[PDB]
Subunit: 359 residues, 3 copies
């Protein structure tokens, strides 16, 4: 037996200053996942449609479905979201969660204010492609859940009794919130979750059955690698959504290994690089930092290939690890310095791999 | 030179709902330990006897002996311990420490209260084999040490003067307490040690010589992987100790490598799995998480084998990584997906490897 | 393609209880750095001269020059520094920073008080070569920067407005201060940076242009591996600087790999070991702990050799990983247990490799 990682990644780019792209991925490794419960199979579906361009609103949906050991899980969430200002963004929404025989629903309203610690022009003009951006991000959340199970009233009253009876509740809550190795992953990425504030508890804010209502804030700090904070605008290109976008991702896994597929189509794949050039967006760092926590437990060979198809007439002007071949606007990366880049990022490395291209 | 890990693990299971088992292990790797002082040789002996079944009391002993670089160390501790309630457990005890020419003794009384943050029945019934359990655990400690060296009065007065003269003492103490990489290992496992409280300092609580007396509390939180908090009941099967149990473990190590042997016999090895099945208990996560911090520094081949001997007539119904062979109730795991599991766990992975069996 | 690490390290030792030595290193690996911006090329120059032996003063200089992606960076700092007491040390100094079209200058005065949490004699006498030393270190800093750009007045007023307007400023500042993975590296090494105090803000403390003036303190704790705290005296051998010392180090790097050279000459290389023996100083732990965070992302072979040249007549009495050869006072380590030690330390291991020698 030998442990090999087989992957194929594909990127097909829309033309113009359309930043749109199709992304496809297939991956196979015969190594165990680091889930203490297995088998672990999961499918995710994300869609997003322009709702009101002019007020900036987008309607986004997410369906998470999985089976763990044997337990069937489901979570959906659909929400309306828009930029109010450069740092203030707002949301109203709804969803449901389910695990085996249990389900509940929920609705919410939420604001999020993203603040960079500094905004120097001596930085702006001297660093062409900046990466690290330190900042802190402020969530303000109104959420409601119908209390229609009796598990829900039990957890409600357990919590209501926990608050007010403890006082280190907005501190210790993080122990519960960031379950398992999620806790550890906070510091791995230079991420800090502040203590919460509870600004109220209401019963019953909804005429149907009893409804449990939470008014709470938290804050999260990042030292620079946290894409949520560092890449606040970019990660939400409402402005480029001229039509509905979508991604389907899935994995199957067990003691024998991991299989994953990805298919999607969405803006943000390429960005203006300055100077008539464009690039594939900078690799977000959290995916690589957090997968790093699992990627080092078995030695593997890399059988990996990337294909990039540029729009018609476009040429690559520069590529970090260089490509192996080209055939009109199709470029392919395989072995050599690219296989070493793939080994590197799978294990936690964030070494830059850059592709700039122009007509 | 090539770096190989040679190991053999053996598990012989007592019948019935006896959860008792014999555990044996031998391990060899020709890679250096990550101790900044070497050679590093250590032997540990643990025993435990039923003292008063009816009041739940157990008498447990531990002897740690080591030699580091050249320094001879010894620590023993024997204590009486029992479950008072489901979360409150109590202890009274004594021991000694020694390093070269230095020794001191000590006696103690201690309570520990283990609290889960939540207890939902929607979880209980829908997840057959749950792993992550978030909680917090409260130590309340009366300890006494005879001040019979003058190193002991020096450390006493140094400490007495440190307290009261500092005020961030119950915070900074963690810097001293979790020496070296032990500090780091706290966050690795989703573990938090809260600040201490000091509830008094007494002289001299003992008629013989002067006696230094500390009344202090601390708290520790875990996000789910902390077996101490997550597996509170299980890790202390007083109820299954119908006779004295024991474990002898040892390692020899240096710049040339690591050798380890383990022999023991104790309850808790198998558990009822529900449905007439039993399993080997879930792998505790802290051993794997903390050994992970050292297991990634040299590449190695795996020459590893597990033998499980079931009681007479019992069959394995399921095994994660499957076994290679069987001969009556002896099952053996070697190479393939098992060697990959062993590589994985030695390096920090916690991928589930499950064995369920029944008559 | 195969990934190999090629290195050569050389140590030439001055005789007597001169602790002086020449250190040379060359390293090559064809693996990518974990910098999200590449190419990344950097040169560093450190010098140090006795200024006033009798008052213990040393004059030290540092020049950091780099190019990242395409951005040209420079930082120099020269300072006068001396031991006042065993734990209090003082500094006065100056420098400049520059990035592209931007530069500023600065002058400073600073004290640093290094405190060990404990000083037991039962430790001192029983552990011949102690490593872990827990402690905390207190910086007290007066710094001034001419406000001669308008980027500098902009950052000044932005900061002045940030202080006083926020209140969790001396907490959140760490998010900004420890940019990127630097934050994470704090906990990796058992290192804690406390909140700051701001003891004043002054304008304009300098007759020329406007001058921004900061009076601030911070504290840092280490659990034992932090060489700054654990090896406070040793890391600053002012007493052994009978002449000017120096080190030139440099690396070139990109998607293709990493190249590094080092040349220097300075005291502190060997230490009295007790018993007529001397050793190469204990490996500092932070270099190895922090490089560990990058060293595990690509598999590699080791083609490494260490040469040690002892002074004339000196013999090695003991070496951890043993040497392969000797020719008069030249000793060479290659392959076997040494290549495994090199793999180990490059990946984060701190396993002791010891060399003791005497006449
Ligand atoms: C995830 C890392 C950050 C974070 C990320 C930020 C960011 C960034 C945003 C929010 C915003 C939201 N966050 Mg938040 N926030 C986090 C912590 C949480 C927690 C929690 C209990 O821990 C809560 C309650 C909230 C909830 C809030 C809401 C008030 C708000 C809208 C959520 C939503 O519409 O769902 C989203 C629906 C999903 C479940 C999809 C999630 C999948 C994401 C993570 C992956 C994106 C896929 C991308 C790579 C592919 C795009 C293609 C698709 C076709 C679109 N956040 C952590 C600390 N938060 C949004 C906002 O500003 O609204 C005001 C927003 O832009
Ligand atoms: C280790 C991880 C947790 C923790 C684990 C918990 C748990 C769980 C328990 C205690 C309990 C105790 N803890 Mg505690 N507690 C920790 C921190 C410490 C520290 C410290 C200075 O940091 C202190 C003072 C205390 C001390 C206290 C005592 C008041 C009490 C009884 C100790 C004892 O009898 O020794 C024990 C004797 C030894 C030295 C043996 C230790 C070896 C252990 C760790 C390995 C078990 C071996 C097992 C795999 C094999 C079993 C076979 C044998 C034949 C039995 N804990 C950390 C944070 N603590 C017990 C209690 O509740 O009493 C009231 C208890 O069940
Ligand atoms: C680096 C890890 C520690 C730390 C290390 C300690 C130690 C130890 C010392 C100081 C001291 C100083 N620290 Mg400090 N301190 C740190 C955080 C910082 C920060 C910050 C903004 O984070 C600040 C403002 C300060 C600044 C201060 C100054 C007040 C003071 C003198 C600095 C100096 O002359 O530069 C130094 C010039 C350079 C830029 C060179 C730096 C390169 C170093 C790190 C490598 C040494 C090379 C060695 C291996 C080779 C020697 C050969 C040469 C020929 C000499 N420290 C962190 C937490 N600090 C000194 C003091 O006590 O003065 C009162 C001192 O001895
Ligand atoms: C509340 C969640 C936020 C969200 C938070 C984030 C965060 C965080 C990130 C992005 C990132 C991206 N987002 Mg966004 N962003 C939002 C939704 C917007 C909308 C929109 C108009 O609604 C669009 C089109 C996009 C699209 C963009 C892309 C520019 C970028 C993905 C680059 C890529 O090649 O992915 C490649 C596609 C894949 C390889 C993965 C596809 C797999 C699917 C399943 C994603 C699942 C994520 C998984 C880890 C689950 C986390 C969910 C939680 C558990 C709930 N975002 C919503 C509002 N987005 C990433 C980025 O690079 O930004 C700089 C990034 O880190
Ligand atoms: C105060 C310490 C606690 C203790 C705390 C813990 C903790 C924590 C754990 C256990 C675990 C176990 N404990 Mg207990 N538990 C206590 C004592 C009880 C008693 C008893 C009746 O006295 C018994 C019989 C057991 C036995 C049980 C087993 C169910 C389980 C081991 C499974 C195994 O296959 O190990 C296999 C045997 C080995 C592979 C190792 C044998 C090696 C010896 C030397 C153990 C040394 C540990 C080492 C890391 C040193 C730490 C000591 C500190 C530095 C002081 N415990 C005492 C009261 N126990 C583990 C578990 O899986 O629980 C879910 C676990 O994490
Ligand atoms: C303010 C900074 C401090 C400094 C802080 C430290 C720290 C911290 C350490 C040392 C270490 C050393 N210091 Mg000192 N020390 C100071 C300056 C003194 C002076 C002096 C008389 O001025 C001298 C001669 C020395 C020399 C000594 C040596 C005993 C020892 C290096 C052993 C070695 O073989 O290196 C081998 C040489 C190399 C392999 C590396 C040479 C490369 C150059 C470029 C160093 C760059 C470091 C790099 C990581 C950049 C960090 C700088 C910041 C970003 C600003 N120090 C100043 C006052 N020094 C190390 C040690 O082992 O101590 C126990 C150590 O960890
Ligand atoms: C809000 C999210 C969590 C949770 C938050 C945590 C936190 C945080 C704390 C508690 C605390 C406690 N939790 Mg709760 N609490 C919840 C679940 C409930 C439920 C339930 C029926 O689901 C129960 C029985 C309890 C049980 C309790 C009390 C015994 C205790 C006060 N909580 C939900 C699922 N719980 C408090 C405690 O004392 O901690 C140990 C405390 O600080
Ligand atoms: C209680 C466990 C630790 C320890 C706890 C720590 C802690 C925590 C602190 C001190 C602090 C100090 N420690 Mg102490 N203190 C101990 C050891 C003593 C001994 C000794 C003779 O063993 C001495 C000389 C001192 C020395 C001192 C003072 C200089 C200082 C006040 N402590 C023991 C071994 N020490 C205080 C300080 O100022 O920290 C730097 C402080 O907060
Ligand atoms: C002192 C070192 C940092 C920095 C420290 C941080 C910290 C810490 C905080 C801010 C905070 C803020 N920073 Mg600032 N602040 C600096 C840079 C400045 C500059 C500038 C023109 O360079 C600007 C526009 C601002 C912008 C601001 C305000 C919007 C906000 C109050 N700061 C420098 C570079 N900034 C505060 C805030 O609200 O955080 C989000 C805050 O706590
Ligand atoms: Mg880590």
């Amino acid at each position: 037996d030998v442990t090999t990682a087989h992957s194929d990644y594909e990127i097909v780019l829309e033309g113009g200053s359309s930043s749109w792209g199709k992304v496809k991925a297939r991956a196979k490794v015969n190594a165990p996942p680091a889930s203490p419960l297995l088998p672990a199979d999961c499918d995710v579906k994300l869609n997003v449609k322009p709702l009101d361009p002019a007020k900036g609103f987008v309607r986004i949906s997410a369906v998470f479905e999985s089976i763990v050991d044997s337990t069937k899980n489901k979570l959906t969430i659909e929400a309306d979201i828009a930029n109010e200002t450069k740092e203030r963004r707002i949301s109203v929404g709804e969803g449901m969660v389910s695990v085996g025989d249990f389900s509940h629903t929920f609705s919410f309203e939420g604001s999020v204010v993203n603040l960079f610690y500094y905004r120097s022009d001596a930085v702006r003009r001297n660093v062409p492609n900046p990466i690290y951006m330190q900042g802190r991000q402020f969530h303000d959340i109104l959420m409601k859940v119908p209390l229609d199970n009796n598990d829900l009233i039990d957890t409600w009253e357990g919590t209501v009794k926990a608050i007010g009876s403890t006082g280190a509740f907005n501190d210790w809550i993080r122990d519960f919130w960031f379950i398992g190795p999620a806790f550890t992953a906070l510091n791995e990425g230079g991420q800090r979750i502040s203590r919460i504030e509870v600004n109220g508890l209401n019963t019953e804010s909804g005429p149907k059955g009893p409804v449990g209502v939470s008014r709470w804030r938290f804050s999260h700090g990042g030292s620079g690698m946290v894409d949520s904070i560092s890449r606040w605008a970019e990660l939400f290109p409402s402005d480029k959504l001229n039509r509905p976008a979508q991604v389907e991702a899935g994995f199957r896994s067990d003691s024998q290994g991991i299989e994953v597929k990805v298919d999607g189509e969405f803006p943000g794949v390429s960005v203006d690089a300055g100077g008539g050039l464009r690039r594939i967006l900078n690799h977000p760092l959290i995916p690589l930092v957090h997968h790093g926590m699992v990627g080092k437990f078995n030695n593997f060979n890399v059988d990996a290939q990337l294909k990039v198809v540029l729009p018609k007439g476009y040429k690559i002007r520069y590529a970090a690890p260089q490509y192996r071949s080209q055939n009109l606007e199709e470029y392919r990366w395989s072995g050599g310095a690219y296989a070493r880049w793939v080994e590197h990022v799978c294990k936690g490395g964030v070494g830059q791999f850059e592709i700039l291209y122009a007509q």
